Amino acid sequence: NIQVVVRCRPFNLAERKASAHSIVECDPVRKEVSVRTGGLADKSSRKTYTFDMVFGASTKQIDVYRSVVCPILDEVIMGYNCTIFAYGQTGTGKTFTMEGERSPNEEYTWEEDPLAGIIPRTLHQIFEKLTDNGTEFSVKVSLLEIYNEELFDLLNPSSDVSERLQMFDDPRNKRGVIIKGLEEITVHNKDEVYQILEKGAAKRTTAATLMNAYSSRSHSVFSVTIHMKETTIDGEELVKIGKLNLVDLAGSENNINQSLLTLGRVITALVERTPHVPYRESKLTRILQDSLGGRTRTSIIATISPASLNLEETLSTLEYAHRAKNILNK
């Protein structure tokens, strides 16, 4: 039930120059990804995997949005909860996919940059989906990050990222938690979302200088909650609450990452139908408990490299993402 897609990144400027041969081949039609596990493109062994969707190195950012995000967002607009994870070795594109980048030399505005990833596009489409239908709505965003099992808020400008938040169990609704001090910024208009990301980025830098390899070892959960009141052409004002969680996971490459380690154990228990699922063993799995075997619609975009020097990691990632397909939750 949990949908899993694979995204291979293209070779960089230094790989094309070193005349690199891709050990990875994608077949979107057959939704399969094939990787050469032994030398020689003249003769060799291969390992194949089938996923709900596969996107080759030529896949553009807009292709990921129209294909995976747009549908998920729709479901969020209907009043449901959805989560999208990005799993993969450092350098394969987790952040590129989830956040994206800016085209060089200020060639475009943020809302039109073809390099923009899921988060900016989503925030911009929410304001162009509901506004363009006259519905009373309200968007809230939060950016909770995890590093060495400590929680950080990368968006409230009052305190710095050296302030560790506390987590407790939410006695109201089961399988949930309360983060004391977590900030929920309100996004009033499109012209306000970039500003928010700008701030987050500035704090991301601070966390990086304060914590070792922060960008590779941390887990980030960017949440967007939409409070809606759709007044159709009739007059019925329906009450809808939708939450979308965009999770940029720590690099899967393998000191110890308790949340990553626990996320793996949790998937294992869910797919092997074991009675006890270790959700409580990490901040990530407790925070996102409802996204693993709960009532939330979840999708995992596993990122991979086409370079042969990343073979071992590429297989581990695919093997992992492949096992994840058997998780049933809704």
Ligand X SMILES: CCNC(=O)N1N=C(c2cc(F)ccc2F)C[C@@]1(CCCN)c1ccccc1
Ligand Y SMILES: Nc1ncnc2c1ncn2[C@@H]1O[C@H](COP(=O)(O)OP(=O)(O)O)[C@@H](O)[C@H]1O
**List of residues contacting Mg ion (CB under 5 A):** 95
Residue 204: which of ligand X, Mg ion, ligand Y, none does it interact with, CB under 5 to 8 A by kind? ligand X
- Taken as a whole, the chain contains a residue count of 330
Q: Does 99 engage in binding with ligand X (CB under 6 A)?
A: yes
The answer to whether 195 is a known ligand-binding residue is no
95 is in an annotated binding site: yes
Distant-in-sequence, close-in-space partners of 97: CB < 8 Å, separation ≥ 6: 7, 64, 86, 117, 118, 301, 303
> Binding of ligand Y at residue 10 (CB under 6 A)?
yes
Distance CA 266, CA 284 (A): 11
SS3 content of the chain, % helix, strand, coil (to 5): 35, 30, 40
- The minimum distance between CB 195 and ligand Y, in angstroms, equals 23
136, 154, 163, 256: which is closest to 197 by C-alpha?
A: 154
In the complex with ligand X, the residue whose CB is nearer, 135 or 218, is: 218
Q: Report the residue numbers after which the chain has a gap, meaning the C atom sits over 2.5 angstroms from the next written residue's N, or none.
A: 254
Residue 316 binds ligand Y, judged by CB under 6 A: no
Number of shown-chain residues binding ligand X (CB under 6 A): 19
93 is in an annotated binding site: yes
Site string for ligand Y, 72-91 (x = CB under 6 A): ----------------x-xx
The residue number with the shortest CB distance to ligand X is: 200
Query: CB-based burial of residue 301 (10 Å sphere; 0-12 exposed, 13-18 middle, 19+ buried)?
Result: buried
The least distance separating ligand Y from the CB of residue 65, rounded to whole angstroms, comes to: 13
| Smallest distance, ligand X to C-beta of residue 125, A | 13
| # residues contacting ligand Y (CB under 6 A) | 12
Taking the least distance from each CB to ligand X, the nearer of 121 and 283 is: 121
Q: Which of 223, 303, 314, 317 touches ligand Y by CB under 6 A?
A: 303
- Phi, psi values for residue 244, rounded to 5°: -115, 125
Q: Which of 100, 242, 293, 294 binds ligand X (CB under 6 A)?
A: 100
DSSP 156: -
Q: Is 94 annotated as a binding residue?
A: yes
Which CB, 91 or 294, lies closer to ligand Y?
A: 91
Known binding residue 89? Answer is yes
Reference 228, options 156, 127, 124; nearest CA is 127
Q: What is the DSSP string of 188-232?
A: -SHHHHHHHHHHHHHHHHHHHHHSTTHHHH-EEEEEEEEEEEEE-
Amino acid at 288: L
Q: Are strands 185-187 and 136-147 parallel, antiparallel or unpaired?
A: antiparallel
Alpha-carbon span 66 to 289, nearest angstrom: 27
- Indicate whether 279 belongs to the interface with ligand X (CB under 6 A): no
Using CB under 6 A as the binding rule, whether residue 11 contacts ligand X is answered as: no
The footprint of ligand X on residues 120-159 (CB under 6 A) is 120, 143, 154
Q: Phi and psi (nearest 5°) for 5?
A: -125, 155
Determine whether the annotation assigns residue 242 to a binding site: no
Q: What's the count of helices (H) and strands (E) in the chain, helices before strands? A: 10, 14
Q: Is 90 annotated as a binding residue?
A: yes
Contact residues for ligand Y (CB under 6 A)?
9-10, 88, 90-96, 251, 303
Contact residues for ligand X (CB under 6 A)?
95, 99-102, 110, 113, 116, 119-120, 143, 154, 194, 197-198, 200-201, 204, 222
Give binding residues for ATP as ranges.
88-95
